[PDB]
Amino acid sequence: AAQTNAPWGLARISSTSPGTSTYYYDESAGQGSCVYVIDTGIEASHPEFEGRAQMVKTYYYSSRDGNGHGTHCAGTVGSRTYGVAKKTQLFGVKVLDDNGSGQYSTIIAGMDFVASDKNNRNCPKGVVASLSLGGGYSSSVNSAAARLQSSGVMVAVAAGNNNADARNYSPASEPSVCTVGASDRYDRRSSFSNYGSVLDIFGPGTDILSTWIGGSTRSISGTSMATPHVAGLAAYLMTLGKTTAASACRYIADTANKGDLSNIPFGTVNLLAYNNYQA
Numbered sequence: 114a115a116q117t118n119a120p121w122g123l124a125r126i127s128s129t130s131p132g133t134s135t136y137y138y139d140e141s142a143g144q145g146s147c148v149y150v151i152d153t154g155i156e157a158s159h160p161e162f163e164g165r166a167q168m169v170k171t172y173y174y175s176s177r178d179g180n181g182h183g184t185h186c187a188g189t190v191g192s193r194t195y196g197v198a199k200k201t202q203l204f205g206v207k208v209l210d211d212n213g214s215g216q217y218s219t220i221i222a223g224m225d226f227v228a229s230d231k232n233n234r235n236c237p238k239g240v241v242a243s244l245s246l247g248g249g250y251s252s253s254v255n256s257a258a259a260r261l262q263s264s265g266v267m268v269a270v271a272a273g274n275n276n277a278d279a280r281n282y283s284p285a286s287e288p289s290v291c292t293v294g295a296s297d298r299y300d301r302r303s304s305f306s307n308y309g310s311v312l313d314i315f316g317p318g319t320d321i322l323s324t325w326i327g328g329s330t331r332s333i334s335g336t337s338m339a340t341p342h343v344a345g346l347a348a349y350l351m352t353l354g355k356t357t358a359a360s361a362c363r364y365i366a367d368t369a370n371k372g373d374l375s376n377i378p379f380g381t382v383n384l385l386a387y388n389n390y391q392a
């Protein structure tokens with residue numbers, strides 16, 4: 114399948130080269146898979162989700178996204194126009210308040226929630242969790258992320274936006290999950306992207322168009338935007354049967370575009386998420 118005039122990051126995910134604008138992908142499109150977006154919520158009524166999004170948990174007075182961040186990330190995972198895996202099922206878990214903040218104890222609870230809740234959902238092709246969030250190092254936060262992964266969920270986490278070594282951030286620094294840095298449309302490391310040995314992969318993160326609340330759209334930037342590209346890619350590749358929740362991060366690194374990014378510090382991987390789809 115081909116999506117013309119796609120957001121640059123979707124075109125980038127399916128290309129050996131920057132500077133194109135068509136997204137190419139297998140029509141299965143993540144059907145039968147599930148992605149949890151653990152964030153500020155998801156505006157499930159947005160037409161872009163087509164009935165495939167639902168809120169399943171909140172720790173606040175509403176499960177609505179009163180921020181936009183979660184809706185944007187969910188859009189990059191799985192919206193019809195802005196998403197990587199256009200037929201996945203999207204489950205929202207609101208661990209962040211409408212200001213974009215949340216306590217680590219709440220975030221941990223939400224991770225353990227997902228590890229159990231997947232047993233209440235139909236996801237025959239597999240389960241992914243996208244965590245566009247983080248703060249400073251916490252062994253308890255990393256452990257929660259590790260449990261979620263161990264439980265059979267492909268966990269993708271943002272590296273963070275401090276232009277620093279992601280070793281000092283959680284859940285970014287958890288070795289067993291997939292830690293995602295950000296790139297721009299010219300294959301440069303995004304200016305804010307964290308780096309370091311704990312990174313597994315880069316995805317598009319600068320000037321990413323996606324859904325927003327009030328049925329709208331906007332372009333914003335962050336490792337928060339790169340993470341759902343990788344999460345959606347995982348869901349897509351799991352639906353294709355190419356990999357599993359336990360092996361998908363490794364598989365994405367194995368099959369990445371290699372050596373094409375600029376301003377990658379020595380010791381950080383130079384790997385850009387790629388679906389290796391041959392039309």
Ligand SMILES: Nc1c(Br)c(C(=O)O)c(Br)c(C(=O)O)c1Br
Pocket residue numbers: 131132133298299
């Ligand atoms: N990403 C990107 C874009 Br967008 C464009 C463009 O203007 O469409 C060009 Br001309 C290039 C290039 O340097 O060839 C690149 Br790389």
Ligand SMILES: Nc1c(Br)c(C(=O)O)c(Br)c(C(=O)O)c1Br
Pocket residue numbers: 245246247248271272273274334335336337338
């Ligand atoms: N935790 C966190 C914060 Br706080 C911010 C921010 O300063 O707004 C951003 Br832009 C990101 C991102 O990289 O998307 C992340 Br992850």
Ligand SMILES: Nc1c(Br)c(C(=O)O)c(Br)c(C(=O)O)c1Br
Pocket residue numbers: 357359360
């Ligand atoms: N035992 C086992 C299984 Br079952 C699977 C799997 O789900 O196919 C994987 Br991807 C691994 C691995 O991650 O290496 C292992 Br070890």
Ligand SMILES: Nc1c(Br)c(C(=O)O)c(Br)c(C(=O)O)c1Br
Pocket residue numbers: 371372373383
């Ligand atoms: N595989 C690989 C890569 Br990717 C890169 C790179 O990051 O561009 C380099 Br600098 C080397 C090298 O050491 O020659 C190799 Br081998």
